[PDB]
Design a protein around this ligand. Sequence first.
Ligand code: HEM
Length: 153
Amino acid sequence: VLSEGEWQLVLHVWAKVEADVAGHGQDIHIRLFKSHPETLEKHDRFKHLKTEAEMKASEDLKKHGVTELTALGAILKKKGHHEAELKPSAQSHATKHKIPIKYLEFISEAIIHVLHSRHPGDFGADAQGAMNKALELFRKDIAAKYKELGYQG
Ligand code: HEM
């Protein structure tokens, strides 16, 4: 469980993300695919994008990042009371996309990296620790749902 002050730090920097969801999402994916190229293989269409400029030019990939970050933002804003918001993504990622927990760690690391690169003044040690706690909680609850649905990845 996060403190009220930790949630405020999470939501303060998430308001900064919302000034450019699309660009944050692009940077997160580029970082994710570069640091962990195996994650690109889960995207049938995007895995054929060969350079960083091709990635930024893909409207499909840009729209996908907004879709992902909008769902994450809606989970974060429930400050842990997020079962109704989290369950549908747990379902699709367990039964259709098959995204292992390790890959959710990889993208959490990319989120942390991008937030620090774009928002250092709003992402000091305390802020980073709170965002890390919130993404850990997301992954913990995603993992429990994965199991309930029979997905051990
Ligand atoms: C913060 C973590 C993530 C969130 C919040 C998130 C959320 C979403 C949402 C809302 C969708 C669209 C609806 C759905 O199909 O469920 C989606 C689709 C998808 N996600 Fe995720 N996702 C995350 C991480 C990942 C990761 C790490 C991968 C792969 C490495 C991945 C692969 C996909 C794929 C393949 C789709 C289907 C896209 C399509 O065919 O258009 N997701 N995700």
